[PDB]
């Protein structure tokens, strides 16, 4: 039973009383930003997509 | 800065909160802050103090004046003592390590004293 060579495990350090949650990273993962301006700087009324 | 701080702590902003935290003004701000957002301010100050250790002086000043101004305002709350509990936890971690750090401070103060003595000799020579 030769034990398999394991590397050094990184330390699970404790987290403060407001960690970045799974859903906060999930909504931060909407990464790539493209800002398309409207014609003549018109305010955008409504966006929509079909079901 | 009271209404701005009220807005930031009531809608969970970051830009308004940081631009009002980076700045008398602090005393007027916490005195014109709403009573119900004091625990929200305590938690949002404990979070920044944990996440960044270099901002401890101003954040302890803010927490100090908040606990001065709205003391019984947190007692009339009392099912929300867990924000004070997380605050106690953060300050206990900040005050961890003090005896060994004092020993190391003395061990370095000896070197600084000798270096300043040799500079005081080298300026007169």
């Amino acid at each position: 039973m030769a034990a398999e060579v394991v590397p050094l495990p990184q330390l699970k350090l404790p987290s403060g009383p407001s960690p970045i949650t799974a859903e906060q990273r999930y909504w931060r993962s909407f990464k790539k930003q493209k800002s398309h301006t409207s014609t003549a700087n018109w305010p955008i009324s409504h966006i929509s997509f079909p079901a | 800065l009271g209404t701005v701080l009220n807005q930031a702590l009531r809608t969970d902003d970051s830009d308004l909160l940081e631009s009002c935290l980076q700045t008398l003004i602090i005393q007027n701000t916490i005195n014109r802050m709403d009573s119900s957002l004091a625990g929200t301010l305590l938690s949002k100050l404990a979070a920044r103090m944990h996440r960044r250790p270099g901002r401890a002086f101003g954040l302890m000043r803010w927490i100090q004046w908040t606990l001065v101004a709205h003391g019984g305002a947190l007692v009339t709350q009392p099912d929300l003592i867990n924000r004070l509990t997380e605050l106690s936890r953060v300050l206990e971690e900040r005050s961890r390590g003090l005896s060994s750090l004092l020993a190391l401070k003395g061990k370095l103060d000896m070197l600084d004293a000798q270096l300043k003595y040799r500079k005081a000799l080298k300026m007169a020579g």
């Binding site: 350090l13 | 401890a56 302890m60 100090q64 947190l74 005050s95 390590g97 061990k107 370095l108």
Partner: protein, 99 residues
């Protein structure tokens, strides 16, 4: 560094250095004593560096700044640790009055 404290070899890891790498480990120790999540390991590394390399501090001026700049941040971390035990008394006063 925790593995090098657990395996008894932190003195062996620090004892063979030269001037620039002592300055590098001092710079890491100064930069990262601030986090209390590894204040213990970082202070232990600074203990061993003071015990090992405090003899050439007049020999090289740039290390003499890096020993003075690490006292400069250790001096600001008792004031942070005293203000957090000042403020920890006020939180302790409020939880007594809730009762």
């Amino acid at each position: 560094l925790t593995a090098l404290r657990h395996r008894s070899a932190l003195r062996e890891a620090l004892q063979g250095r030269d001037e620039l790498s002592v300055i590098n480990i001092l710079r890491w120790a100064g930069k990262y004593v601030a986090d209390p999540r590894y204040r213990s390991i970082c202070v232990d590394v600074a203990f061993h560096l003071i015990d090992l390399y405090a003899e050439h501090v007049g020999g090289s001026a740039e290390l003499a700044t890096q020993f003075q700049q690490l006292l400069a941040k250790v001096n600001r971390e008792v004031e942070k640790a005293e203000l957090a035990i000042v403020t920890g008394g006020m939180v302790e006063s409020l939880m007594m009055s809730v009762e």
